[PDB]
Amino acid sequence: KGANASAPDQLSLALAWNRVDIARSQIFIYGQQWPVGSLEQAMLDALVLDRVDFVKLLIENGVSMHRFLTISRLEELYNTRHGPSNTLYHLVRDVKKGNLPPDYRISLIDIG
Amino acid sequence: ISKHTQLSPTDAFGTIEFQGGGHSNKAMYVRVSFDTKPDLLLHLMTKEWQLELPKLLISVHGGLQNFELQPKLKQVFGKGLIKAAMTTGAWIFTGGVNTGVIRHVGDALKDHASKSRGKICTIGIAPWGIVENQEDLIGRDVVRPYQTMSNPMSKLTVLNSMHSHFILADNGTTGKYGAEVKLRRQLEKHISLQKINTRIGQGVPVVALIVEGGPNVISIVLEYLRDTPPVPVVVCDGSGRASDILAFGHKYSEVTIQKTFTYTRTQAQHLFIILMECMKKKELITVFRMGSEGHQDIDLAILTALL
Amino acid sequence: KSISNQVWKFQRYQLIMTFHERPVLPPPLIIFSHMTMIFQHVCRDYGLKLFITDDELKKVHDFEEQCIEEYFREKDDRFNSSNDERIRVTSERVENMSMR
């Protein structure tokens, strides 16, 4: 309340705090008037950070995964450093027979 | 316009999938004229949607403007309505568009859908001119996806999800109501005369449920109480609107300067005339109060008020 | 015994599949089948898969969605009626009621 922040900023703060009940009770309320392309960005940020409860909450609050997920957004989701450590980079190195330059964007063809 | 509408065949009917909330809920729908014969509507709802004749008809009326109900009151209303419409084959006639009491019915069905089997046959009779996306429904005979995202500045409304069937009526105009009241009333009248499976000779029993309301809910209650078969109504006390006015009038049977409630035309308004035409037949109206009086359960209140 | 039964049931698939590829003639007469493969060298409706139309595919998809929904609902209803969950919920409600 005292941050003088709009609904996207309140949602971003709740995402950073990993408190979903605060967004459930205070943020997602009648007549909040999210701007265009705000819930989609919230879905992308909650998808990167591995916040399953926030993804479920956004799904229940309007955003459809058929219209959100595109080629560019999926390619972005494959190249994030936020979240638990994975083993995708070593797999891409093995498939690409080595010689992998540092700071290389992983394309969907390499995922295939 | 001076009622200059082209008579054209229906170009919008099929199934809509509600992309949105975490459910996969289909919904049949059809676009029909503002004045169609109820025999055709009954035939469509029986032979084409594969639905049996109901043993109970619940007509839900309420306010169009969005309101809110305090907790421990909506959870004793929605669950009661769900139990009453699930223990018996019932058709929950509703407005259809996601606003007002329709939102409450929708979330009541959402609460039931995650904790029990079966489906509640909810039929939403909504005017065609208020849907915020007329497109994506103009598709014919095939499944058409539909988004439940609400745009604040669209000056329209969206079809409420969690409804099993829809009947969309249009009179040519777009953006205003008034194209479904006559159709809904005539459909209820024509279905109330339909013979139930018992061979005594009685039609199916219909009932009315009132939550919140306005200056028009009193008129439709008066119309319900004056039909050739009387139709009992059930009102709620915690709404605060004209339903609570009916609750206040139920007490002190038979303080006239109390009409200055400022809800609609604060002073010198002619609603007391129809409120006096009502309460003369105060043998059908049943008032539900949470813990103040008997019948603490809505399902008990609705069924008892019908016998 | 149990491991052998499981492994034999698994290898039944390989046994069935290896006879769906062998030539129809036995090894003493298999030379004729190999000659035919020479003629076909210069030249799966069933057995593995089952091709279906779009409406049948949609019916199967709806059936599978119904099955997974029923599975999750049954799992939740079975978990919520266990003795341990009932005891835990009763203990928490009793503690809160005592405080109240």
Side-chain angles (χ1 to χ4, degrees):
Chain A
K1 299 160 54 184
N4 201 333
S6 57
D9 291 357
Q10 299 174 33
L11 190 48
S12 174
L13 284 183
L15 260 173
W17 300 347
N18 200 4
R19 293 295 293 269
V20 64
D21 46 74
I22 304 303
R24 184 90 57 87
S25 179
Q26 277 76 17
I27 301 179
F28 285 97
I29 207 56
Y30 296 104
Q32 270 288 342
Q33 197 181 9
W34 283 272
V36 284
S38 65
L39 285 185
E40 184 275 329
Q41 273 289 341
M43 171 59 77
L44 177 57
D45 296 334
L47 225 48
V48 171
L49 296 181
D50 197 338
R51 301 263 183 261
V52 47
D53 295 321
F54 278 80
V55 178
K56 181 184 303 179
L57 182 61
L58 288 165
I59 283 296
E60 291 185 349
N61 271 264
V63 57
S64 61
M65 203 66 64
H66 301 80
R67 309 197 63 82
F68 156 72
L69 182 61
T70 72
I71 298 180
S72 304
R73 307 190 201 275
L74 183 63
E75 190 177 18
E76 166 61 34
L77 286 169
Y78 271 103
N79 300 264
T80 55
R81 271 64 48 92
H82 313 151
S85 60
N86 56 86
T87 170
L88 225 175
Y89 193 76
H90 305 161
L91 264 48
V92 177
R93 186 201 315 271
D94 294 2
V95 171
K96 226 70 173 183
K97 69 174 187 303
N99 59 88
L100 187 56
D103 302 330
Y104 160 75
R105 294 281 295 185
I106 306 177
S107 53
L108 286 182
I109 308 301
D110 309 320
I111 298 304
Chain B
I1 58 180
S2 302
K3 195 56 66 181
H4 300 155
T5 66
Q6 219 79 9
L7 182 64
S8 59
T10 86
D11 63 325
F13 56 96
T15 306
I16 50 183
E17 294 198 359
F18 291 109
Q19 297 171 353
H23 287 128
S24 182
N25 182 264
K26 320 296 184 303
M28 313 293 295
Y29 78 105
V30 69
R31 176 166 181 247
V32 296
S33 303
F34 63 96
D35 188 10
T36 183
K37 305 307 293 176
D39 318 0
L40 277 314
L41 299 184
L42 221 171
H43 208 359
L44 168 63
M45 290 190 298
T46 301
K47 86 151 188 297
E48 294 198 22
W49 296 347
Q50 265 63 75
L51 244 41
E52 30 68 37
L53 286 174
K55 313 298 181 182
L56 158 67
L57 197 93
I58 302 181
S59 300
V60 179
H61 291 277
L64 281 316
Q65 301 301 327
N66 196 345
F67 56 92
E68 55 91 13
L69 301 182
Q70 60 274 34
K72 291 192 57 57
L73 176 63
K74 66 179 303 176
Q75 79 166 3
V76 311
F77 156 78
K79 295 305 293 180
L81 176 62
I82 279 303
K83 182 171 298 300
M86 190 177 62
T87 56
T88 316
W91 286 2
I92 307 181
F93 273 54
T94 42
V97 290
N98 184 21
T99 168
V101 77
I102 317 301
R103 179 190 308 274
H104 295 271
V105 178
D107 60 61
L109 265 74
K110 286 176 185 179
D111 296 0
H112 157 264
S114 63
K115 302 192 306 299
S116 181
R117 319 287 197 280
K119 298 300 296 299
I120 316 297
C121 178
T122 308
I123 293 185
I125 300 186
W128 168 270
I130 332 287
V131 291
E132 83 170 0
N133 289 120
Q134 294 83 357
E135 285 73 22
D136 313 326
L137 258 53
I138 322 287
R140 225 207 192 98
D141 320 355
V142 85
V143 180
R144 301 297 300 175
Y146 195 64
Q147 284 81 204
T148 37
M149 177 66 70
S150 176
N151 190 21
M153 34 75 67
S154 60
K155 303 301 173 58
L156 289 179
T157 189
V158 78
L159 287 177
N160 174 235
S161 62
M162 310 302 301
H163 277 211
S164 294
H165 305 84
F166 284 93
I167 297 175
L168 305 170
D170 58 328
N171 50 7
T173 70
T174 57
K176 51 191 184 62
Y177 295 96
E180 85 295 334
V181 39
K182 182 68 59 57
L183 185 139
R184 178 172 169 180
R185 169 66 264 193
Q186 292 303 320
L187 182 54
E188 294 184 36
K189 176 79 63 176
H190 182 258
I191 198 56
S192 178
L193 268 62
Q194 211 73 11
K195 201 67 61 186
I196 205 181
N197 66 331
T198 83
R199 318 302 301 112
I200 297 187
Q202 56 172 345
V204 307
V206 312
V207 84
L209 187 54
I210 303 299
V211 175
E212 202 78 12
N216 194 24
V217 71
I218 309 299
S219 59
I220 65 186
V221 161
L222 184 143
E223 180 264 306
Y224 274 161
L225 266 57
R226 207 175 294 183
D227 296 321
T228 131
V231 174
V233 311
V234 177
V235 311
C236 306
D237 62 330
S239 306
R241 220 94 78 82
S243 78
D244 194 13
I245 294 302
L246 284 174
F248 182 78
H250 200 74
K251 195 258 303 178
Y252 178 65
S253 174
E254 53 187 355
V255 205
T256 59
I257 60 180
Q258 278 64 25
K259 60 166 56 184
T260 320
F261 31 65
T262 69
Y263 175 54
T264 157
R265 204 201 310 175
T266 162
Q267 195 52 233
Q269 76 294 341
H270 50 63
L271 57 81
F272 217 102
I273 44 172
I274 65 182
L275 196 49
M276 276 289 301
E277 293 181 4
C278 293
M279 281 277 315
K280 183 194 305 175
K281 312 182 95 297
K282 195 204 60 178
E283 59 204 10
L284 319 161
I285 306 179
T286 302
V287 183
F288 167 76
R289 290 194 163 89
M290 181 55 182
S292 179
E293 301 172 352
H295 289 157
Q296 292 80 5
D297 295 358
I298 281 296
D299 54 313
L300 296 177
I302 296 185
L303 298 177
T304 44
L306 190 41
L307 303 178
Chain C
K1 177 187 181 60
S2 55
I3 292 176
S4 303
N5 281 334
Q6 187 181 255
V7 171
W8 176 80
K9 289 180 178 180
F10 177 78
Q11 295 181 356
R12 253 178 61 82
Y13 174 82
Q14 187 62 36
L15 165 68
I16 291 172
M17 198 59 57
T18 188
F19 274 110
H20 204 39
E21 201 272 342
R22 284 183 177 174
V24 72
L25 295 184
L29 300 171
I30 210 180
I31 180 177
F32 297 153
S33 297
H34 288 174
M35 295 295 189
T36 302
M37 297 180 59
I38 297 304
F39 291 165
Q40 303 289 153
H41 190 62
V42 308
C43 180
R44 292 295 185 180
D45 300 326
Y46 195 66
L48 277 70
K49 314 173 180 54
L50 175 66
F51 305 92
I52 54 180
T53 60
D54 301 1
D55 46 358
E56 303 289 338
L57 184 61
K58 195 58 62 185
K59 187 184 307 303
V60 170
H61 281 352
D62 294 2
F63 168 71
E64 181 194 297
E65 291 183 8
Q66 173 182 159
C67 281
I68 185 176
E69 164 191 350
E70 210 284 333
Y71 156 68
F72 271 105
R73 176 154 50 247
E74 166 60 34
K75 164 176 166 296
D76 273 70
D77 296 334
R78 174 165 45 87
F79 166 69
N80 280 14
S81 71
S82 63
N83 283 338
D84 305 328
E85 183 71 17
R86 278 172 176 173
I87 290 177
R88 182 189 67 84
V89 172
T90 299
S91 174
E92 292 184 4
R93 285 210 274 261
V94 157
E95 176 182 359
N96 292 334
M97 185 189 310
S98 175
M99 175 265 298
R100 189 81 62 187

